């Protein structure tokens, strides 16, 4: 039907049949990871090639491919053997978060270690990291993940609350050998436990709360069609979902009276890093880049009704490849569901006698993903007035370590002993934008103060400038929250009936960016997070701020190198990247599971309507 | 009962006859404020003494008088005769607000301005609006509006959309005169209308929107006592009403355990002003403080349930004075109800096998004011985890003016003809801070960059840095968001289990401060605008940033004048002054009635609690 329809099981099926058939599945080959590619450029691209694009591990050690299938003609139409060392290695499999504590548990160094600290091996758990890439040259092409050790008193105990600092290993898990432990010395391990459903911690659980139930009466206002296709209150885009970067949308588009006007082709978050800034040499290499090094969207949550999604909703359930090619449904993985948003507009007027209410409402699409301690919702908001948002929400359990005697200057304390070091959860959002149509330009907006004097006597006005960004290469943007920066996405022929070019207006939350000194690795790995606003030429392989192999990636890869192009970016298909993040010293407070805490930036229609689109709302 | 309980009918009757029986309110009198004034600085005190303050008017002129009496007692405190030209002119009077138009119609400078337009007078509406201070001498002690007019084509016309450009009057409301007409040439009177309720212009309404039920089928969770006292979720405050600042919530406290912990004394909203930045002289003048001039809350609506307020909600209806002393009742004007808040707290755990979803919620206390053409709501959040917040959203219709044929560099364009001069909407709260009591100090905290070398090899390291502001000379500053700059509240004298002050950080949006020009008249008169935080000693006579008089006073009272005292507020009594607001260049979106905007701020808990309060909650 649609070509952006969710993936089949049988397509996938299809898939791991044609690499079958075409000999590229073997035994020892994994599914790293597998998704559906989106149309090519067309405005009626009739031929339909349902292509999927596959990153193969081989577990023997063989060098591994990137091969795109279609799906549709049962071919292979690429195959490519990647140089790990140049490229990047695949991203991390599922099935290798066990082996960094397995390994270890037999390695006489780890034992020595965790036996001068008198913690039995049996409790002790190993997060299976990423590694990034440093001072160690023996790394490079090799797949390595790193591991930090968190004793489990029992099955139901969370081992968050007993972390081992001054030891850290380094694990490769393809020749399946431990390839180093550093013990820099020991540390007390902290000895409350962290158990938020232990009575003897939460106390008498609340009687006060009341029910609040929230019912549609005759069904949800929105319509689902074809699988993914959701049309709501003038609204109309379609849902799709990638193992890597998890719900994203597409085609959204507004019908204004008799047009289905365009607005955004493509918006996904692309990147989500997690540096962490304890300069400890246990630490100081941690930097999770939970999209591109893990895959968000493989590890998204089944939602329950009521506790995760309450009110009339609708679920999606997306199916992904498991490491074989077989397909695995994520069952209720995304929540679709409008909401009551508050007042829309008001106006009591005395001279007309008129008193006028309208109330708000926001189509919701959200999903929830858990990549080891944290547990991030990711929320698409599409409002009555034309407004796009987008807002994530972090939880889940701090990342803890030992609060060093003497306090710290990175490391913040939770509990006696238990410390939690300082890092950002920074996200890239990817606004494949089509202001009506794909003709499109971005404008910096800063407020413009002015001097009192001629033409301003009382010193009264203030006014706005607009820059137009015409080539990449003035095309990386900071923000400026003093001015009130903002950045303006129109369409240089299409005009309103005002004659102004129609446009978009993009609010950020101006939160610092990445605060790692600019000749670190994770600056050069994580070039995006250094700045707000990067606007690229559109280009289909240009699909991660960080590139495609993010895992043990040297640096400079994505954002840096599509930029370096220098494209004409004034009225073309273009790409904007904004990055946004949360700066956190865990509080007493995160502990022992974290209250949610959010971000995100929202897009405002800047002259795109010839009046307000919400005057046709009735009272109700 | 409370002494922070609402005022009664009966109180105010009360000082009505107090004051006649004194002989400060005989028939030329009337009342431009009353409120009651909130307990002195006495745990509990000898007994209850309600106490109000008045401003009197004098409608023939004679010199007007600040007032308090204690309606206990049946006394007058204090009663001091005003001089308006130093200290400032009361509050504008509603019934002087029709004066204006009454006053202009057989004006003949004002007829021969509209005749040159071929406008019939009857049908020429004039908002009369506040005059500030500016450079005509004869207006020093005399109480003026401007005007500016509207054209009303019929009777439920929206005459926001007919704007008489190059043309405003001056008015003395007290002697009955116009002062000055001044006419600097015809602009075309744009034609189109705003009619927002003509089907004309919506077209058929939407039958798209299906029902979305809210309630709560064992009523709310929260209790209300003595009328004003809420309860709930841990929460304990007093909700106040005053005719200038609207709703003031009173000691707000957090049951953490057994003790009933103080947090925040006393929040408001003292202060907003909107300031025009169109240097035409028509409207350069043009700057209104819709608390200390207009007096927000006696513009209160009734708001209505189902559109206004949806779900379970409990409404207050406070008690004000008209302009003779009389009480009157604003029914339904204060809507208290709990929402629901999405996802409170998430972890599903691999180790321990443990998933865990806990929903949020939050207490909303709110009311709506309409002044002339806008709109505000005003709100105040409390949720579950500590967390307290405020928004502010604007509505209505906005401001317009004639769009220049040339275009303009400070007014846009909203229909033919049709412009909308920028302009911003600021707020200042005013936090009278108690965190676990009323010994506290503020401190600035910036996130710190590390650079890469000698104890930060891997240059990953980031940290923040705590300023204490000592005196009230260093207590006024500005925001920094690429800092990530926030305010935390401590006292220095109670400390959690982990032996750190207790605290709350104030986390604010970071948008533009007063754009006007640092000689200019509004600069001076809304100098607390031009900084994000100010500090100050606490004072009972320090309640506006602004001063008791603002209406046509120059600068000289305020904050400017009360930091000077620089006394000490490291470990005291101190008030917290956040400016925050709205820069609107308005879009075509905004008509003919503008969708909700919104700004605010939010304090949370900083090391104020051992660990998460929310480790009760219960699974549904
Ligand atoms: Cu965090
Ligand atoms: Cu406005």
């Not at 240089?492 to 009936?497: A, D």
């Not at 405002?604 to 009735?618: A, I, K, Q, T």
Request: hydrophobic fraction near 35%; glycine fraction near 8%; proline fraction near 6%.
């Amino acid at each position: 039907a649609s070509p952006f329809r969710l993936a089949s099981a049988g397509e996938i099926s299809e898939v791991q049949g044609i690499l079958r058939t075409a000999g590229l599945l073997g035994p020892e080959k994994r599914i790293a990871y597998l998704g559906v590619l989106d149309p090519a450029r067309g405005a009626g691209s009739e031929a339909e090639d349902r292509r999927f694009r596959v990153f193969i591990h081989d577990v023997s050690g063989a060098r591994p491919q990137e091969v795109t299938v279609s799906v549709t003609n049962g071919t292979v139409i690429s195959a490519v053997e990647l140089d790990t060392a140049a490229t990047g290695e695949l991203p991390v499999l599922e099935e290798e978060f066990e082996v960094v504590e397995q390994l270890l548990a037999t390695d006489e160094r780890w034992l020595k270690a965790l036996a001068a600290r008198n913690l039995d091996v049996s409790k002790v758990r190993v997060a299976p990291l990423s590694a990034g890439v440093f001072e160690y040259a023996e790394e490079r092409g090799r797949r390595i993940l790193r591991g930090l050790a968190f004793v489990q008193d029992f099955p139901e105990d969370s081992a968050w609350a007993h972390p081992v600092d001054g030891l850290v290993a380094y694990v490769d898990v393809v020749s399946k050998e431990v390839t180093r432990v550093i013990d820099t010395g020991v540390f007390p391990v902290p000895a409350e436990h962290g158990n938020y459903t232990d009575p003897e911690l939460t106390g008498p659980l609340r009687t006060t709360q009341k029910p609040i139930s929230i019912t549609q009466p005759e069904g949800p206002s929105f319509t689902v069609t074809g699988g993914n296709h959701i049309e709501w209150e003038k609204w109309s885009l379609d849902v799709g979902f990638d193992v890597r970067e998890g719900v994203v949308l597409h085609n959204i588009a507004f019908r204004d009276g008799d047009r289905l006007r365009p607005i955004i082709n493509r918006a996904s978050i692309a990147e989500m890093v997690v540096p962490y800034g304890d300069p400890s040499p246990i630490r100081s290499w941690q930097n999770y880049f939970d999209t591109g090094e893990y895959l968000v969207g493989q590890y998204a949550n089944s939602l329950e009704l009521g506790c995760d999604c309450l009110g009339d909703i609708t679920y999606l359930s997306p199916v992904i490849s498991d490491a074989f090619g077989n397909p695995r449904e994520i069952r209720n993985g995304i929540c679709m569901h409008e909401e009551d948003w508050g007042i829309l507009a008001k106006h009591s007027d005395l001279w007309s006698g008129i008193n006028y209410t309208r109330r708000n409402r926001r189509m919701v699409i959200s999903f929830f993903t858990t990549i080891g301690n944290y547990d991030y919702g990711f929320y698409w908001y599409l409002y009555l007035d034309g407004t796009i948002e987008f807002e994530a929400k972090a939880t889940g359990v701090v990342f803890t370590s030992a609060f060093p005697e003497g306090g710290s200057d990175n490391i913040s304390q939770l509990a006696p002993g238990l410390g939690a070091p300082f890092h950002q959860h920074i996200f890239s959002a990817r606004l494949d934008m089509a202001i009506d149509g794909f003709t499109n330009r971005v404008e910096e907006e800063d407020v413009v103060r002015q001097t009192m004097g001629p033409g301003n006597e009382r010193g009264n006005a203030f006014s706005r400038k607009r820059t137009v960004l015409t080539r990449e290469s003035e095309a990386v943007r900071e923000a400026d929250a003093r001015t009130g920066r903002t950045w303006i996405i129109s369409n240089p022929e299409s005009k309103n009936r005002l004659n102004e070019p129609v446009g978009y207006k993009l609010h950020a939350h101006n939160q610092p960016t990445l605060l790692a000194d600019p000749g670190s690795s994770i600056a050069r790995r994580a070039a995006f997070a250094t700045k707000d606003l990067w606007v690229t030429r559109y280009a289909d392989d240009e699909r991660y701020p960080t590139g495609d192999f993010v895992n043990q990636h040297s640096g400079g890869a994505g954002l840096p190198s599509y930029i370096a192009q220098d494209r004409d970016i004034d009225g073309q298909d273009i790409v904007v990247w904004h990055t946004f993040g949360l700066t956190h010293f865990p509080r007493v407070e995160d502990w022992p599971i974290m209250p949610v805490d959010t971000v995100g930036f929202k897009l405002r229609p800047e002259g795109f309507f010839d009046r307000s689109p919400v005057l046709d709302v009735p009272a109700n």
